[model samples]
Target chain A: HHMLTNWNYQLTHFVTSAPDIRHLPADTGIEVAFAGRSNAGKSSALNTLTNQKNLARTSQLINLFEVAEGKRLVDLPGYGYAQVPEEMKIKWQRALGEYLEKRLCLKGLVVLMDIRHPLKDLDQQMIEWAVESDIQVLVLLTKADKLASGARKAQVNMVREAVLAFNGDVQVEPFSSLKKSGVDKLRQKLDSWFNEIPPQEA
Target chain B: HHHMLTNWNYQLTHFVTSAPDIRHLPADTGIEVAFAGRSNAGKSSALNTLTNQKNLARTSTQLINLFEVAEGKRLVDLPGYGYAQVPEEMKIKWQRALGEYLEKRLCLKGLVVLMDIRHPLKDLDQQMIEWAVESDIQVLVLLTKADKLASGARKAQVNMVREAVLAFNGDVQVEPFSSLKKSGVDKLRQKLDSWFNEIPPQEA
Candidate 1:
């Protein structure tokens, strides 16, 4: 089960606020972000992927995990909760927007979603943002264990269709932390990102 | 199938924006139940399934549909949130309208917050529950799309969401529901009946 040995995934640092992005570990490596609506099981998926129980806590801070030399996984803060003060929500959004727009080492984003409610408004906006920024995006429909076999297949196809509708080079797949489903698929995707050479900036 | 819904008659009467827009309704005197959830959490499907009508609730991105169940009794379908295509300014406008409606609408007795059972207690869902608690409005969480999970898994999810809601010190009810399987309708019906029957029609 511990097949993904090429890249050592370990929690390296935490950025608690927008201004803290400048203090992130040297931004010299390829980075992929995992983001979604709060409680979309983003933490659970990350924990499962890293084979750790609490590697990614449910918090507003951005987590920086060193997967390999010059390669990292960014866990962006979850958004769209109403209880959060409007000012705080705006701040997090601004930070995430800035990170997505300016982070030089960011090569891709993994947008997690519940299988039953994929393609939510916020999910679409993230995908659109990724496309506009020329960043590769992977839409992970998490919580697939809750869906029966047929429903899971149908939903995967449905989500794929919706993502394609946006006319972007996005990939869609079903993942489950409980069932360990799609773990290999995800690992392979990450492997590709880590192995591919970053394009030179003009 | 429709016989179950016969005990309660619900009909769409009017659509509204602000509190002033609600003046046209039947006096806002009786208790009303409102259904709300993130888009695609199956709010529209639940309403239609509860009424035993296929198209009673219009499944759209944004639009508040109001249904009349009896003289002065109503059922409101609030616009779904978390739609990204909606412009930011428009999203804020609708949210403000919703906040005003929830805080000021005196007739709103209870709220039904729909969540796909697999992803219950999401941030937006929690925010809605908090508002309900602040306003002293009762909340019933419909763990919709229950048919997708096995019975054991579904039961566990229902308990998990129930406990999470309780943790918030919020008075919220939760049930595993599946419009596709037509399960849990009786429980939902009972809750609605109690809410609508609370004031006893004012004896007029």
Candidate 2:
């Protein structure tokens, strides 16, 4: 069993937009990225994972954090309702696409959706992109604290079925930042990627 | 001590879409306050809290819910915006439908715009504000998920949003609210009461 006591993580620095991916920590080691709609609690999940309150402030900028030597977490800028100009939105969208398609060090992605509204359009697009890229994806149904137990289970099953239809390396699980539920499962998933055999060897 | 909502008596009446779908609704004589926000902005929870009914506003990605509070008083739960996967054409269709409803729906008396407290005043929210402004409709901004922040932080945010909204239009109001903790429900109820009560009840 994994314990929060076992992991050591810290927010490293802001990586800004996609063009700055070239300047990211060498792109040599394993890293996992978190993507989600704006206000989907992506930062909260990161904070919960790192056991830090203000590690990832709620913002539009992409942020990077160090989990351990050669292991990192990328907090991609959230999409949807950014309040920026249309041109600015397109610019960021292009940047995000480039990073996802080209970021060599990224091993997996943690996509978040509110449990009440899972598999939304953008979510499906993200999953499709991940599948096409052959990157493992973990769908986190966030805000589980808001649902009754039965509803939460039903939602989890529903999302699982929908994701499985993609026929790709994708997994779905219910998570709650408020209740701290499912954090262990998240950590285990992350550990597998971070500790996996190197790509060339395996 | 306001039992205003007790006598107000709200009930979910119908769901609607295009012009013809709205044409099928009950006679458009009653006043309605439409609630709109981005998906996952706690809109369902707020509607449930306000009406004291569980599942009254189906918390799904699709569907628009309409509730009747009195013979001539109603509430509308508009389809959420900023859903990324919807095709551009579909989004524009929904937006046009929303614009028509807001502009031509004779009974729409006000709009309650919900914004997640942690991320308030987004661009789509600004568009919503513009719609209300163009229609000369009253708007009440609900800074939802107030429970997520400390009391001091919540107060600060409330003031910040209130100031920003007022700067846009002196009449638009703002308040911090939390459906999880049942905060600000009464205030919202009171506001709704004022809007609906202004219209004289139709003769039977």
Kindly list the per-residue Cα lDDT of model 2 for residues A40-134, writing each as its tens digit.
99999888776678878873456777776667788888887556798987777766676678888888989999999987746787777777778
Candidate 2 - CAPRI tier? incorrect
What is candidate 1's CAPRI-style docking category based on DockQ? incorrect
Each model's Cα RMSD = 22.6, 22.1
TM-score of each: 0.46, 0.46
Q: Between which residue pairs do clashes occur in model 2?
A: A121-B85, A122-B85
Instruction: Specify the poorest-scoring 10-residue window by lDDT in model 2 chain A.
Output: A1-10
The deviation in Å at residue A130 for candidate 1 is 0.6
Which portions of model 1 show Cα errors greater than 4 Å?
Answer: A1-20, A199-202, B1-204
> Where's the lowest-lDDT run of ten residues in candidate 1 chain A?
A1-10
Instruction: List model 1 lDDT by residue over A1-202, tens digit each.
Output: 0111223232334433334477667666688999998889998988877767887888456778776566778988887766878888777777777788888788889999988988774788888888888888998988887877788889999888777766568999888777656655576677667766565621
Error of 1 at A167 (Å): 4.0
Model 1 fnat?
0.00
User: Model 2: DockQ against the native?
Assistant: 0.01
Residue B170, candidate 2: C-alpha displacement in angstroms: 70
